[PDB]
Paper text:
The Klebsiella jumbo myophage ϕKp24 displays an unusually complex arrangement of tail fibers interacting with a host cell. We observe the tail fibers are branched and rearranged dramatically upon cell surface attachment. This complex configuration involves fourteen putative tail fibers with depolymerase activity that provide ϕKp24 with the ability to infect a broad panel of capsular polysaccharide (CPS) types of Klebsiella pneumoniae. In this study, we combine cryo-electron microscopy methods, protein structure prediction methods, molecular simulations, microbiological and machine learning approaches to explore the capsid, tail, and tail fibers of ϕKp24. We determine the structure of the capsid and tail at 4.1 Å and 3.0 Å resolution.
Numbering used by the authors:
A (entry chain L), B (entry chain G): 2 to 291
C (entry chain B), D (entry chain A): 2 to 50
E (entry chain H): 99 to 146
The structure:
């Protein structure tokens, strides 16, 4: 119940600027020197990765030209944030390059800095399909009516009148999402990324049919890849922290949630052939005495 | 037994236009957010995939020049609809392609929409041979007479004098089929495809022979690949639903069906050597009384 | 199996004078306009030498 | 989905006289100077033949 | 068959060209007996 006061950085400074939570001090004695020290074991706790959260920032402008923008917007929001079974393809690792010249004839070489780069994010989503199969319809109709159509290569929305001449710009049929890596307590942001220019790319939903009556019916799983143009910095970290602050937990107790069934339905009460029924209206009790 | 009123979309609109059955409302909270809520578990039921039904729509015109068009046209319908052990190769997945140009020298890029295309169906049927080899004979004679003949590359039906010109058009020796992927109750159609221009292509039936008297005799399976042009959309779904409204299940009950034998056959009744015979004729019948 | 009655030239006149067999009608829609139509694909059958 | 109001020419004039649609301003900062700017990426869309 | 695109969406049109038939390459198998009458038979057949 005690640890050294220098275990946690007093202030988030220098290379820890912009950090949201508590950052361990690297100047505390470590285990891999001469010998491990038990006095500083509180500072040896590890870091474990937690699932990422998708926050939707922008809706496409094409939704306003349909019959119900509320439906399209809400469906996209739920699919991005709540139906996301998995995510993958996010990466902004750095990469350094050097130029090399021999240092004498003996075999040594002299290395000089050349360039620095950054990896690219390729958002990938996975969904599990449901009764009435709404997800495949959502994405197929999105592509067909807001992007090209295979037979003619023209969006099906333009079959209406009055679509603006500026339909070809990305804002018409693209959106933006924010990815955040929270802490174990879900109170601070450790990593954030802001990707835009997002619309379906590559293969669409898997639409296939076949007949085999002896084979057990199976379960479909949608997977889609997206375009992206990502940004990272400290402003994105602040944006992620604000988004995380909007999601408060005070007062929540999953143990004390009210049961989703308050009491048995009326049909059960009428059958009068249960455990309580025998006591209520079968046995006599003249009483007990001594 | 009480789901929320908003689990099922009240009406099919937006991306659900033309849907036949009941489509789940996709703005109900899902289980992959902060926590799942047990009050919305009826909405977690998963889509499960059922076998495809094939309907014959057109017959080749060459059946007319034959001595019996009825038998050809009945055999083709039965083979397509009833004897089809397995079907595969039906696919109309989409595909989107983009073009790129770097957004600076860091590594990022800007992707611009280029084109959208659709997949192609390659129907494959599979059958099991029967006594007399009717399937292999049907298909071999179809190819030989209504299609090229290997030693002359001429249809064998032309040996009759009077065959009309315009025998090179597909309507002479091609047919059409409609495929439907229904729901668990088999009342509403979820996916459909209307392929035409269908006729055998590539390898025909098996046709090998061999001698081995020490081996166990084996069966014969027929695999046939076809050609075709397919259409997809909403009109095809309406056509499929019109087809599936027929073949209604009202009235039938497999459990209550009559047995395929009503009573023992006469020769059995003449032997007089069974269970009932002992009671009826052998045992003494004095009567029991007290 | 049915097709458009205008699929085949009926007279073999103009540039089809002297033809022996049947000739397709060039005035029925082809696939390389705005979009193809599946109602007229019978005229998309091709030549083979 | 919001983009810079100055992304498109207000009037097709100068070298854009007679243009038949929307034309990029060619005045928004490009991506090949000191750095690319993400506030002006809507104008980085490319013509496609 | 031959093939030609039916529009630019990806669908294609297929037409008949030719029909061909397979070819037989018979193979027999025997088991040798005392003496070697089978080998002698075939070798002398070929040689003479």
């Amino acid at each position: 119940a005690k640890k050294d006061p220098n275990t946690i950085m007093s202030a988030n400074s220098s290379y820890a600027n912009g950090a949201n939570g508590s950052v361990t001090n690297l100047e505390i004695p470590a285990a891999f020197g001469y010998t491990p020290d038990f006095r500083y074991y509180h500072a040896a706790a590890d870091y474990t990765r937690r699932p990422t959260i998708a926050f939707l920032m922008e809706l496409p402008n094409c939704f306003k030209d349909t019959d119900d923008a509320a439906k399209w917007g809400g469906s996209l929001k739920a699919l991005i944030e709540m139906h996301s079974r998995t995510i993958d393809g996010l990466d902004y690792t750095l990469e350094v390059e050097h130029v090399e010249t021999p240092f004498g004839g003996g075999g040594e070489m002299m290395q000089t800095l050349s360039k620095v780069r950054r990896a690219r994010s390729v958002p990938v989503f996975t969904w599990v399909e449901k009764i009435g199969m709404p997800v495949s319809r959502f994405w197929n109709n999105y592509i067909l009516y807001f992007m090209g159509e295979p037979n003619s290569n023209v969006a099906g929305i333009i079959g209406k009148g009055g679509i603006t001449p500026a339909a070809t710009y990305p804002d018409y049929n693209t959106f933006s999402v924010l990815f955040v890596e929270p802490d174990p307590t879900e109170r601070y942001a450790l990593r954030s990324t802001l990707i835009t220019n997002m619309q379906p790319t590559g293969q669409g939903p898997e639409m296939r049919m076949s007949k085999d009556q002896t084979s057990s019916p199976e379960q479909l799983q949608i997977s889609q890849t997206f375009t992206g143009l990502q940004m990272v910095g400290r402003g994105v970290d602040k944006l992620g922290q604000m988004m995380l602050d909007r999601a408060s937990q005070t007062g929540i107790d999953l143990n004390a949630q009210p049961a989703f069934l308050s009491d048995r339905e009326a049909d059960v009460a009428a059958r009068t052939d249960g455990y309580i029924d025998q006591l209520v209206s079968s046995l006599s009790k003249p009483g007990v005495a001594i």
